[PDB]
């Protein structure tokens, strides 16, 4: 690399890359040089950057970041990416003064135009999102660069194909929630929702709860509510529409979004008002996306709990009470006859009916007189149906041992329920950890 | 991958160790011309001291000046590698001060115009040192009159133009500049910063910064908190008053510039300027300092924190105390009135789970000779109405078997003033439980 | 053995804990007569305990003057023991001072008037508390004009006629005395020492003798090294600093008797002698020295021992840093100049047995990345040619699968200097060897 060009200052240094802007002499350019060190790269993550790298080759187009070369040495690679100094996209509208329907329009031409080379190519992008939407530089009118082919996947003309559960979960395409195979469309869809986003500056489908943020995706539950939407064009929302539109099938191209009236005929469609609202709107939008930037794998507990979930774990905490209290006859009210369960007292085996845990009822949980406290932890309930759900905890419990000393051991429980004759009913359970008699 | 150092140097004694390196003395074999050889094992050199290495190669290359410990050569033997760097044999500037029978302001500015032309020179070749201390202040040689001369650029980085930057945390306790210390970019007005505290103490041997408590210091330093008390200053120049300023300024954007230091009228009209009485009370002093530096100086690293604790961090250890008591006594409402009731903790009868509230403990109030240690106590002061301790908690028992034992945790509790009382949120236990 | 307390008292709240007692208040039910009843599980009386308890009860058995906490009865309910004492409502005297509108010299006389006659009568009883303080010194009332009254005779201990004797370090640090600090036979001057100590801090409202550093104190007052600063005691009555030099003498023998100072002028003719100004300047410290107290106060046992280091300390931890970087640095060169040829040590590597000489670590210097931590360090200063150092030697290292891992040790260091040169005679390491 040194060889041709020249190394400055760092722009950025993930795991096993750094990078920095470069020149080269020969020319008087100035790059973006990725400093991939070798020796920390595994053989999986061998495999993707080989991909990224192949595909980056093959799409040249002024709204792509072009790779302008490839080159090795001592464990140490170099790619060449172009410079980018415009940063975000949406981080340039919000400090706009004047910001429209035309503005947005413009925006979408230039991504369209980089979908559809890459859809030309062969080359589905799958993670269209705001952060992989740059400005070649601050310049006024910098061009609009679809930037990280990290996800991209190579496909077979037109052939649609299961490649796998990727994407940003506001962004996934009904079709992958669906898990169906799907192929360029996903992509489009993408684009509807970044439309949607360019012109109110919130999302079109968002939720708290994942689960429910998909069954709005994959129903198409979207809407233009008043007044923001009051003031935007048919067209626009037309064009939106044809994106997201639930049957990739029927779903507008990149082709066909070049030649909507809205698109390529910018100058009568679009309205020309400024969306301050919109530009409010997309502040908070930016921020929350920079707070919510997990770095890491995060995993958040449960708890807020809807009425539903909340009746499992009720019925739940009641079987668990008439245990340690030694009540036989709650138990096999809550539990169904047939009840099968995995534990530790079994041995690795699966036991079925009442009869092994009646043992438990008969002689300890009540025989034995010393005072236990039970703890749920960090419940999560899965809603499989109006009339089924499963439940998973942590069971910790706080007991005198023989020497009369406090102890505590801890459970993990899954337990299945079904609603039978109007009552929630358990048919299994598998206890993993400690048994629960001390 | 060559064979120079070995078939055209001789080694002999050593002069200084390194993280990395090790500095002989040599002797180039054809002209009998001496150098001080820093050699590596091309082994050692991880990506990192790889990187390190030809980091300070790359920018003592770029240093060629009088007042500059000059790089000479850059060989690689297939196996080694050395830095061959003109041979010091001053010693430090500091220790030769004290020695002197007269020594006035003339004497210092002479002393910080040829420092500043090495800083001058390194920063106008976009490269900032970072570490500018005493022990870096040498002599040429032990000729009367010698130069004094910046060494050891191990913590010198390289910078674009006049853009600043996160570089790292890097410099001595003393010398750090306010924008370090408050995790600001910096370049190269960190130099002009320790300039000044370096001229300060060439005034009058004492440190403009100075406290056994390393965070009271920091905090002197970024509020620019020093003065110029009497009668030592009396007798000084407005003009070193006035440079010192310059140079000590909180905001790196206004401190005076090694260029424009040189054109003070202090140190470019020094002969008009400066004044000449000899200053026995700054050498006086400066032994002392001397002596005070040498004794801490950095060899092993040391931790030792339990200073005069402040009324504030008092407090916290008293509640701490208070709380232990509680539960040592079995007294759960003590408990409840001290522990906020959202109270979340990790502890070893926790196993592994965070749990949160009050009932997890009421447990062991309900159903389980006595003497607690506190050990070492840590307190930081977050906020006028928050706080965090840290200590080791070394409780003596007596076992079932009547035996006597001892048993360790490590605790954290965080503290938090709310409607007036200390209140404690959270604290995490690792080693024992404090049940025998 | 009776059953006399529960079937003529009734209980009530907590008002202290003690290490082997309960004070609560408590009410004689015939009289509504209400008392303070210190509890005692006859189960917790150890033959230790039990000597203890039945001390405190002969001792305040003997003890009936008005200044004076009074015991009133002694029960032993068959499992249990009462001693009923007066309960004292008027909360510590120290804190009734600075809530006073007007204070003086003449208040402060009255005031040591109360505590030496309390003082006088347990000596004439052959009887020394050995523990005077703020704590101690209580009001009968919340009556304006109550008594001071003198209370918590649990250190105190009894006499014989004049005879001194060695009764065990005992006592508050601030207020013990000379003798008792040299480890001298001691009696009744040690109470006289402490009331000059409480006189000092009733004029000006700060102590005679504070550090941070209990062993420097301990030298403070060993030397009687208090004085008057301006411009406080300026305004101080002559015959008022001559009573404080007479209780704080530091030859015992020489030192004013209780009765004695009961007949000193300022405290007899105190409506002659003793100044009336007030004295805001000592309410303003007072509540200062208050508000200190009672963040310190004796909750749990707290351990703290890192303080500004002095120079000669620093030297010892120097010496030791270089030891063990020669040591990492496998340099049995500088091992053999810095131990001495008779070394001694115990080490996990011995086995248990005391090796001497070199000739056991050659061996590892020898045949045999790293990061050594001293943690902690104590020196303790033996002469101007001796110490001992003991740290906490806390070792990261790479293991052989290239892994990181942490060692600790324990190790004591005895340092002679001989011929000029700090030398170590004796180690003596636990826990971990020094070797991966």
């Known amino acids: 690399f040194t060889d041709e060009y020249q190394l400055f200052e760092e722009l950025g240094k993930g795991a096993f890359s750094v990078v920095r802007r470069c020149m080269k002499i020969p020319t008087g350019q100035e790059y973006a040089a990725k400093i991939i060190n070798t020796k920390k790269l595994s053989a999986r993550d061998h495999q993707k950057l080989e991909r990224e790298a192949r595909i980056c080759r093959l799409l040249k187009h002024p709204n792509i970041v072009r790779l302008h070369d490839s080159i090795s040495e001592e464990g140490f690679h170099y790619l060449v990416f172009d410079l980018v100094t415009g940063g975000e996209l949406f981080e340039d509208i919000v400090a706009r003064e004047y910001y429209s329907e035309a503005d947005a329009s413009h925006c979408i031409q230039q991504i369209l135009e980089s979908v559809n080379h890459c859809h030309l190519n062969g080359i589905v992008h799958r993670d269209l999102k705001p952060e992989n939407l740059l400005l070649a530089s601050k310049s006024k009118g910098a061009a609009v660069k679809l930037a990280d082919f990290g996800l991209a996947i190579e496909v077979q003309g037109d052939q649609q194909a299961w490649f796998g559960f990727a994407g940003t979960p506001g962004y996934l395409s009904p079709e992958v929630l669906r898990k169906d ?24 489908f968002w939720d708290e709860d994942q689960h429910r943020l998909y069954q709005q995706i994959k129903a198409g539950a979207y809407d233009f509510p008043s007044p923001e939407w009051d003031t935007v064009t048919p067209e626009a929302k037309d064009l939106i529409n044809k994106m997201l539109t639930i049957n990739p099938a029927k779903r507008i191209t990149a082709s066909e979004a070049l030649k909507h009236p809205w698109i390529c005929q910018r100058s009568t469609v679009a309205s020309m008002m400024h969306r301050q609202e919109t530009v409010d709107c997309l502040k908070k939008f930016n921020a929350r996306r920079k707070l919510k930037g997990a770095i890491l794998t995060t995993m958040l507990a449960t708890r ?86 499963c439940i998973a905890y942590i069971r910790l419990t706080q007991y005198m041992d023989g020497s009369g000393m406090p102890k505590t051991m801890q459970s993990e429980e899954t337990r299945v329920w079904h609603r039978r004759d109007g009552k929630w009913q358990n048919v299994h359970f598998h206890r993993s950890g400690s048994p629960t008699v001390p």
């Open 181 to 204: 195979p799907y192929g360029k469309p996903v992509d489009m869809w993408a684009c509807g929702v970044i439309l949607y986003i360019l012109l109110v500056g919130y999302p079109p």
């Open 304 to 389: 807020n709990f809807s009425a539903r979930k909340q009746e499992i774990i009720k019925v739940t905490e009641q079987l668990i009470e008439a245990i340690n209290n030694g009540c036989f006859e709650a138990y096999t009210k809550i539990c169904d006859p047939g009840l099968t369960a995995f534990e530790p007292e079994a041995l690795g085996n699966l036991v079925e009916g009442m009869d092994f845990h009646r043992f438990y009822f008969e002689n300890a949980l009540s025989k034995s007189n010393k005072p236990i406290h039970t703890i749920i932890l960090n419940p999560h309930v899965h809603l499989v149906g109006d009339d089924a759900a």
